[model samples]
Target: MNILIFGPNGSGKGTQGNLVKDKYSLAHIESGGIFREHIGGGTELGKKAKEFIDRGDLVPDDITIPMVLETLESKGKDGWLLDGFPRNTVQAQKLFEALQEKGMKINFVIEILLPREVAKNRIMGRRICKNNPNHPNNIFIEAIKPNGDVCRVCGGALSARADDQDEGAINKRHDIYYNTVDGTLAAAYYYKNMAAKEGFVYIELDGESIDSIKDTLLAQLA
Candidate 1:
């Protein structure tokens, strides 16, 4: 049940990742968490990664792939759902080969496709529940629209994440995600090609309602 997932920031991609994790009991591994654990644990790789972080530079794939693989092997004892890595085509190629060397098969590669503008709006509309950040809420989304100015799901206090409201920050991330050349889309396309020519199972999804998206994803998996 190993999976790789991709979506722009506001695509409800994170929500789907959690749903899949619960359904299959796979580790929901995010790339950011990998670095945090390693750095906090003071592993050699963490030390190396920290040097780059301190300098505000991208960590090289040579260091990143091994670090990611280490976590996958250790924490993904029951398979895993990996999100937010191989952020470019180059890294995608590297990760594909590296995973092959480890003899792990990616049973599914999921890409949630949303228009760039729509994704931006979703991010801008995002509101987190103070009581439970997990309670999904967004002003632009009809299904989970907030209850007045509070959390829709739990009636808890809701507030926008600072990062979400920062248009510059949002654009910075969306820049990478929406860029077809050597960006996250390129990375996902790399797998799409694999699915076409190498028998990899790639699931391309429309950014629809959560239930519909989940239903389609599970059916494809089944």
Candidate 2:
């Protein structure tokens, strides 16, 4: 069961993706990890990508598309849960064409929908437990709200991630994600339009409670 997932950073995308990936024993192919593997290994494409990265410029699609395809093909031979690529409409179209040309099937596309402001709040409210980062704790989330200034689960010290506290960084990313014209939403909608004709299921989940979203997703998959 190969899948492609789309969601903003604070929308619990990673948690849900991990659940589905583990359930199916699929390779979890993350976009950032793809770049790290290539660059760290000093592959030809990696060299090109590193040049762009070092210069503080976005890697061109010609370099990026092939790198994504290569990783999907090689690392995801068994099955894969792809996360965080196709950040715009052009990349989405290019990736679809590339996949079709290579005869690789995308069985499912999952999107978690949340309001931009709500998503931002979720990011800002997150608290990391010293005992275990995995322990759920967020001031904005009632189900996992931390116990005062400590971890809810273990009473360990809790702190916010520096990145999470950076409103500018969050807004920068959210701008791209929320832009419907040519950004991530456009990329996701491109697939939405093609899902029926292309014989793939597109699952949309409201970014509410984790359990509810997971239950709905699993039910749809079943």
Candidate 3:
């Protein structure tokens, strides 16, 4: 089961990707996580990636494709879901060629749908626990826990992670698509055609909350 879960920067791709990964036993892959690992692991590519990140810019493509191809090569013959990869058609085409060479392809692309305003709302206040990374939210406090205290599930300290509450960054990112570059719309249509051609189901989820999304996601499998 090859799957792609893609959306804008703050469309809950990470959360849904993990859930799918666990439920389906599929490898979860994301470019950001890949870069993060490289940064933490101190790879040469990571060092190169750091310059772009430190300057608040996107990573260069030459440094990107090799790493992604290597990841696909390492996967060999396993189901996987990609998040935050295949960003533009060029990357998608590159992935197509790479998989073709390896005699491989993914099965589906599931895109999470949300408006820019909704994305802003979801991303700006997102917080994670310092401990118990997997603890689920119970919705007592939308922005933070009661009195804005510890983790809702594990009582661990909760702090708004960096890149959280970054409305400026969020808007600027979208602005690139609208003015500087047209990406999301093109990618959506591209994946739609690709998935349909491959006899893969294409699902667009319009989930107002996590619960709604969870229900829809679980229903797809169960």
Candidate 4:
């Protein structure tokens, strides 16, 4: 089975994607990793992408889409779970068309639903326990709210990652993710609408409790 998943940051999207990967033994391919692998290998397309990166400019779509498809075609021999590729409706359309041209089946499309503010706060509120990285604590989550600046579970000193508290960066990512006009959500809906008439499956999960959402997702997938 091939799957495309969409969700805003801090929505437990990665956690669930890992679960799905384990359950099906599928190749879990993330878009950022693709770029790194290509660039690190010093491929021609990666060279083109790095030129733009060195210039502090975004890589154009022509270079990016082909690289993505090449990665999917080569690394995804068994099947793949694609995460974070299509960040806008244009890319989404191009990807779908490319996959069709290659005779690959997009069996499932998954989207996790969370309110924009809630998703934003989840990112901003995260507090990692230096004593235990796995300890769950967040300033905005009542279930695991930290004890002031200390860890909620063990009262250890809580430290926030620099990127986590960067409100500007968080807003920039969420702006694209939450934007329905032509952004990530629009991309997801493009597939969803296609699924309505294309006879594929589209599944949406509530971005609340992780286990509850996992159960719902697994049931739908089955």
Candidate 5:
């Protein structure tokens, strides 16, 4: 089953995506991975994209849309879980149209909702375990709170990621994600509005515990 997932950085989107992707053997197509593949391979599109990037300008949708489509078609033929593209209403509309033209189906659209402040706090609270980064710990999350500057799972030293501690950067991303009119949420709502008529299922999830969200998502999929 092909899926599109939307959530803020600290919403455990990646964790849930890993679960679904592994269960279904789906290609996990992320936006950044797409850019890396194209640009790193130096394809014609990548060359064009690089020129824009070199000038410190965002790549236009004309280029980005085709790149996304190409990756989906080539790598996601069996099934795909798409994440992180269509960051605006325009991109959403354009992507839907392109998929329609190519007869590619989006079976599900999933959005995980979290309050802006809560999401920001979650990011800031994240602590990485020196022993095993996979040992999840967050100061703001009661279940996985670090043992006062040590890993909860392994008693390893814990430290926050520099990026996670950057409140300005986190707010900048949250601003785009929480903007309902033209940003990521608008992009998600575009699909939600058309789900019924377009014959796709749109799923809204609360950004709660990973197990809870995964259970709800799997139940809906089943």
Candidate 6:
């Protein structure tokens, strides 16, 4: 029941990952969380990462790749919904090698296809509640209220995500996606063909709500 989902940042990866993870009894591995821990833990790798983070520079792929590998090795056997690894083809090859060694290949890799422009706009409109972060509909708060804006779900304050409305950032992300993630799609296509050879299957998903995606994925539970 291991499913690897590929999508852009604003493509509802986390929401859909949670949906599938819960219903399939699979663990959710968030690359962002793991990367944050590396910085907070201040291990040898964390120490190396701190300088780059403090300077607002991106961490190199070498450091990030190891953390991803460690994460996969830890949870691969338990069955997991992978959200943030294999950002490029090189990484995808490493995954293929790991799966080949494990003698347990991935059952599916659902590529959630959304246009870069649409994703940027969706992220632009995005808002969220700071006080009630867990509200199902707490996607993006349109404005910063007086911190007393009551959440409809639980009467908590709703606040906008500071990063959510940054149009410039979203544009930069679009550039990154085309430059960096094109390889991932290429890899997925290769694996889709491989899965076809092996009698497994792959799928492409339209950008849908989390519940709808869950329903679509569950239809393949057989």
Best by TM-score: 5
- Backbone collision tally, model 5: 0
Off by over 4 Å in 5: none
TM-score of each: 0.87, 0.92, 0.70, 0.93, 0.95, 0.70
Candidate 4 lDDT by residue in tens digits, 1-222? 899999999899999999998888889999998898788787889999999989989888888888888888888888899999899988998888888888888889999999999998998899899999999998987878889889888989889898988889989999999989999999998999999687779999888666878879888875
Show where candidate 2 strays beyond 4 Å: 130-132
Candidate 3 has a TM-score of 0.70
Decide which is better by TM-score, 2 or 3: 2
TM-score of decoy 4: 0.93
Pairs in clash, predicted candidate 6? 127-139, 127-140, 127-141, 128-140, 128-141
Residue 204 CA error for candidate 1 (Å)? 1.4
- Please provide, for model 3 over 1-222, each residue's C-alpha lDDT reduced to its tens digit, 9 standing for 90 to 100: 778777776676787889888888887777766766676676787888788889998777777766676665565247788777776767666667776777667676787876777667666655667786665442232533323466667678766766866767878776543221336546656768777667677888884566678668767753
What local lDDT does model 1 show for residue 117?
A: 91
Best by lDDT: 2
State model 4's lDDT.
0.89
Candidate 2 residue-wise lDDT at 60 = 91
Give residue 74's error in model 3 in angstroms. Answer: 1.1
Provide the overall lDDT of each model, using Cα atoms, as 2-decimal numbers. 0.89, 0.93, 0.68, 0.89, 0.91, 0.68
